[PDB]
Structures are given as C-alpha cells and as structure tokens.
Amino acid sequence: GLTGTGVLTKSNKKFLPFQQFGRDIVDTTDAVRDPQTLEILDITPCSFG
C-alpha cells in the first residue's frame, strides 16, 4: 500500500521484530521492510535542482 518513488539502498538500521517502516522528525518515510526478504532498506529522494 505504501507508494512513492526514490532510490533504494542498504542501511545499518536495526528495526524491531514488529516494525514495518520508519519516519523522521518531519514525518517522511525513509525506510521500509521487505515482506519476503526482511531486509533493511532506506529510501532517498531522486536528484533535482
């Protein structure tokens, strides 16, 4: 259900066994979980300027 766009890379975050996604202070999604692999992936916005 979580839709968006960006670059997916590997991060060093250690989620809990009941966490799905992560949010920052400004309440923007920056990390998700793989439903079939259970891997920590971070979301970064694509380049603009």
Binding site: F18, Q19, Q20, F21, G22, R23
Partner: peptide, 26 residues
C-alpha cells in the same frame, strides 16, 4: 458450587508509571 475465596481490598498505590505501550509501528 460458588468458591468465592477472594475479597476486595479497594487498596491502591501512587508509584506505578507502568501503563505505557506502543501505539503504532513507526
């Protein structure tokens, strides 16, 4: 049968900061 071997003491305390749980998964 009615084994009512329990009594209500109506006692409490003022040192329990324990009612805290996780409201969501963020």
């Amino acid at each position: 049968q009615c084994v009512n071997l329990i009594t209500t003491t109506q006692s409490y305390t003022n040192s329990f900061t324990r009612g805290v749980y996780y409201p969501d998964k963020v």
